[PDB]
Amino acid sequence: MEFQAVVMAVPKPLLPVGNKPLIWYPLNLLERVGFEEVIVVTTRDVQKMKPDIVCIPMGTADSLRYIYPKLKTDVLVLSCDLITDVALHEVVDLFRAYDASLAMLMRKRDFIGVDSTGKRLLFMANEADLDEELVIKGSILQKHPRIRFHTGLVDAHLYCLKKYIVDFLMENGSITSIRSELIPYLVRKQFDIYSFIKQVRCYVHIMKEGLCSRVSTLGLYMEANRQVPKLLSALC
Amino acid sequence: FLKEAARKRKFHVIVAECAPFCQGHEMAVNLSKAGIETTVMTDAAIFAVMSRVNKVIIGTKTILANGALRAVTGTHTLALAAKHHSTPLIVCAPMFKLSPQFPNEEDSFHKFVAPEEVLPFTEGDILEKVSVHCPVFDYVPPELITLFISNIGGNAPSYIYRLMSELYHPDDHVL
Amino acid sequence: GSELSERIESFVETLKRGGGPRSSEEMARETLGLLRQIITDHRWSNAGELMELIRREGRRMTAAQPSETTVGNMVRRVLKIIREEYGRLHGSLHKLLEDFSFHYAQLQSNIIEAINELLVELEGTMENIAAQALEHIDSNEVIMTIGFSRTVEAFLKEAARKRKFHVIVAECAPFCQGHEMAVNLSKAGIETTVMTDAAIFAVMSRVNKVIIGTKTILANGALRAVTGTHTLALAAKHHSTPLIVCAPMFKLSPQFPNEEDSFHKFVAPEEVLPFTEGDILEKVSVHCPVFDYVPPELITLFISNIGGNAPSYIYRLMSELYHPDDHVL
Amino acid sequence: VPTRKDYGSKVSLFSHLPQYSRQNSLTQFMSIPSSVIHPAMVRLGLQYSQGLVSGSNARCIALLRALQQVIQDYTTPPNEELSRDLVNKLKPYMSFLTQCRPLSASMHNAIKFLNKEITSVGSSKREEEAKSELRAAIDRYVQEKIVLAAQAISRFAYQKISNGDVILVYGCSSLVSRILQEAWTEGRRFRVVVVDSRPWLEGRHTLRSLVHAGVPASYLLIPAASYVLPEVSKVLLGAHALLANGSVMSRVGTAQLALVARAHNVPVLVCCETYKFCERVQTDAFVSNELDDPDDLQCKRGEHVALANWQNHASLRLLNLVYDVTPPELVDLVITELGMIPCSSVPVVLRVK
Amino acid sequence: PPLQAVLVADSFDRRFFPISKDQPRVLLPLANVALIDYTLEFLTATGVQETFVFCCWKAAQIKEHLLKSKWCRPTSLNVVRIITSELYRSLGDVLRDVDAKALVRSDFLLVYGDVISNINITRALEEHRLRRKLEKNVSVMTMIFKESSPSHPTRCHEDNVVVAVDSTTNRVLHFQKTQGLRRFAFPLSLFQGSSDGVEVRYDLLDCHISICSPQVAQLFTDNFDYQTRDDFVRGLLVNNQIHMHVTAKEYGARVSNLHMYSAVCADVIRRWVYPLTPEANFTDSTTQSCTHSRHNIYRGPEVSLGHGSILEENVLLGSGTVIGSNCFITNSVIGPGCHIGDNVVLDQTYLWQGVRVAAGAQIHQSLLCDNAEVKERVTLKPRSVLTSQVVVGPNITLPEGSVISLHPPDAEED
């Protein structure tokens, strides 16, 4: 079809958030809107739509290349810890209209630069790589003289990716943990990946109203456990 | 053409009677019988009322070769008023009303009937002096026409010559 | 006193820099008040010296802004008033088959009285024009206008209390002022509509009447209206629809289309093409004319405070309003 | 797929035409992996609704490429012929595309040609061969009616443009821009006057394209066209469709421009392809037209918008016309790949195809 | 509080190094009219009630030109005051002297004597005052910027700047030029307090118009090594707050070098600085009257245009200028008292008063100052500037970028 579903879980993914399985929330984000097939990459102990479950005897990029022969069309990566009240169409419309190569979703130490219209991704960097200051090129400003900076947003770890990007992940085994190596590289490349295109663009979606909380600690765990009930009241 | 669209649209129809034979009254009655909000009037008030009109749809007796018509008396003035106000004048006529002749002839174009309809016989002795003429039809040039709605679709008057070439043979024009 | 000088300089500067009074009525009132003031506090004895002083000051005010002809009209009206009052106190082909150096005493008081009478008439012109709305508007009528004019606004909203019609408003591309008029009309429940100039001819087949406002009326019955009125008049003439012009008497200038090129007021191209385009602004030549010329042949009637008249009689109004020697000013 | 709901209060004279809003898209109520609608058609409808592809030929080219993709991605089911299956399957896609944005004459003609070609496929031929033949027919049609026709019209119009001329164009038409660029490259030395209108402001596209080409150009809005025509020597216009009665259906600001040009005694020319020649007839733009988003009429003048909240006034209406019709009495010449023909020869060319 | 301004009629930088030897930068005729006239008209039109004119270089000429001008008349609402001194070497010394004399009281404007603009500052000044009354001595300066495109000819590299401002409330967090530099650096201090409405702006034209406060002059006395305004802003930003105001429907620009000069000239002739145009005659002079015609062609009195010559685009003819036969002039500004020959092509050329051009000359993109003269069969290339009272012999072809002046070492000699 158009998109393929993949939910990576590389216990933590089995924590009962809201007395329900933690991996049940991403699948619900995938379910109710087509998605008759889903591919899950989990540990050996993690086991119970139509889930295609594979074990991991390792980073996100390695798992994606590990399931490369499986994928056949554009991918939509989802995380194990993901409870959100967003409409998936909001990010897929951006991926569909501008024929973009990368589409991400975030919610209000990691600096991001968005253009005037507010959805073009122009700059992406971490605080650790920068030495002391923030360096910006002249060409990006000649094309886009206005760059709105965000620092406080959170990364939901969900991306609408193309197929040749996965082919590129297969080619170069240097990128690991795409969330910190592939997305910044693509953002720095829109201004090699140019061999599998047969111009690169990256887009973003900001909700500013939601429960887009990615569970990665005990505090966020309790916060999600407390906020899930008003959402489960409408979902089910 | 008018009563086929009244089932899905609502409009106002103005009907101008014909002075010699007031045949527009029957049309107005038949249209009002279907609920179209029709009105009847004289020819003298054609131009006076043709400032609020938006479209004109009429029928002809025959279509000449250069796209002109032989219509009932009063259509030439209607076309003149339409051209003065720049209003489209539609002519709904089938293909059998198309004659392969140009305005060659003279005087025998119109059909002249007894003057009884114009001036009655009970006037008096003035009928020996007064000369009365009663033309039934008139000539409408093509320049005042805008469109021709036929069974094969609407067309412009500047293409009627082709319909002639398509319908009749050049050797059978004189008959 | 120098206060008169300070006022004259401020008036000339405000007219030359930007626009002054927003409404034409306020402009005429301000001009007449300044003229009355110049007559009141000044050293003048004879009519020729006063007329030359007023002529020099009016020439300055006109040179400040040539497109602002309401001030030239008021100056010429005051000059005609002075000449008439002087002839009242001192004493063409049919005619054909003058010093102002005599000094009277009550000339100033009656000049001021005449100016006040002109002011009151200037104030009543709006109601006098708006009172003739029902004579030309009917029920279930469609009216088309362009721009924003107080006279046309009053003429339209004065008849909505007794008649119901549909009003179409065409905005002005450089300064979209028709939106305010459309909003003000819809606030009174007139069933107004807003549209662009590109769809003027496309919609001008279902229109029944046109009522518009002008900035000034020329001598042969032509107008200096906002940009877009020439096309409106052309469409009206193509569809043979009457085009009414609601304009008071102070919008009448005694000049024929003599001039060339300085007719229209050209403003910065920022409204047409923004400054943020790029480098193409060095090559592309942009022009932004505010006004345009409308010939008299495309006009049908003129509704004024003294009743409607045809354009072929505007010359007589000129002869009635201004003096032939004060045409050049 | 549900109905495309309307937006706002429409005008009394255009109460029969749809009025939508660009912010509210119809892809909200659909599955992310589109099952009932083809993904290519979904992306095409989204691009049409968002205004990404704005043009008669850009729209037709995008539609034809999407149809090629659909045919490549479509496999015929059993116990049924392909010649009728493809037409029946493409019908809802066309319905969805029309719901996203009313189709143009070019798209209608292209869809008619494609349906004819699909119906012409025999039941004995194989599936792969039929699909390849359809894709090749689509590509040859694009090549003949769009690229080669544009070259023939430019080659014919090059003789009409002379040195020292002052040509006046309106809106954004790729055919006019290509004609002017080729005439300038062939050695002609003239200057163009670009006329634009709100709210699309698409004339700036042709303006920048000409500046990039090196042609001296000017820019102004349509209400001042009566001011620039006295110095204009020729008026080049683009047409989206030519009806059977010779009338020209094009952007809204064309009929008024042609009217003003005739009043100033300036010969008007029209450039159009033969595949944009519609067989239907229309006398004015009221019975059939297209109403775009009314919120485009809002403008930031000064520091406040006079039409910021127009829906609060129940008596206030916002009219945003798109197309318009011009009578044949205002068009001097029509340029096509067949040759220069008058406007009262539109049906004759429709005869030959 | 009456609005008061400070006018620096001397720019302590010398880029017009040949031309500025005989005659100041601020009296160079742009459109037959000096730049200080443009600046004074802008100040008088924006609402300024009093100005303080400071001059060091060739101040006698400046003062006796202002004293003939219309702003020094008893009927002017913007009373001007000339303060002259030979010690001033930079803007910092001028502000120090203002603080020493206690001339200013309230929010005053700081503008150079070569700024051409039609911007109204009531809005920005109102914003400034309200902000200052919520923060009594915070919010000390407001720099006016005109939003443009980075492609525009008016944006020269020598003045080109990049800002890192707050989008919630306009506030300057980082400000730096981009003269000869390809990748910009922005420190991390900016993202310290709030960190949500931060934005980088590269589409801005520095109008060199700043709404200053007496405290600015105070700080100028405090910091002795503040030599300009830019250094004041950098030294305050390393550490009081400085804000901005962006305009999109008004024009404003400062003539800093020659390239900036030919950009404002083109804009002024093309009516981009309306109402300030040659047709308006905003100086109230009798020898600067003109008539605006089609294609933005300006003709003065006694133009004596010869038969055959063609004016094709935005040209400005002076009063007394004589045009010959069969000429071609375009995008060129000609001064009063000029005298052209025959078969003379002028393309983007600027002739000042007292120039004579012989027949057969072809001049393109070059500037002729007062009393210049060229003989027959002479061809000038782009950027081929002639200073005052130079004479170019016949049958000479000047190279591109050539500069001729009567002083020996500036660039060349007669």
Numbering used by the authors:
A (entry chain I): 1 to 10, 24 to 61, 71 to 79, 84 to 134, 155 to 237, 262 to 268, 297 to 334
B (entry chain C): 177 to 351
C (entry chain D): 8 to 98, 108 to 113, 120 to 351
D (entry chain E): 167 to 519
E (entry chain A): 41 to 279, 285 to 459
Text from the published report:
Crucially, for every round of cap-dependent translation initiation, eIF2 requires GDP-to-GTP exchange, catalyzed by its dedicated guanine nucleotide exchange factor (GEF), eIF2B. Molecularly, eIF2B is a large, heterodecameric complex composed of two copies each of an α, β, γ, δ, and ε subunit. However, we and others recently discovered that binding of the inhibitor eIF2-P to a distinct binding site — located on the face of the eIF2B complex opposite of the substrate-binding site — allosterically switches eIF2B from its active ‘A-State’ (which can readily engage eIF2 and catalyze nucleotide exchange) to an inhibited ‘I-State’.
After 2D and 3D classification, we generated a single consensus structure of the βH160D decamer at 2.8 Å resolution with most side chains clearly resolved. As established before, a similar pocket widening is observed in the I-State structure of eIF2B (2.6 Å induced by eIF2α-P binding). The βH160D decamer rather represents a continuous distribution of conformations with a more restricted range of motion compared to the WT decamer, and for which the average converges to an I-State like model.
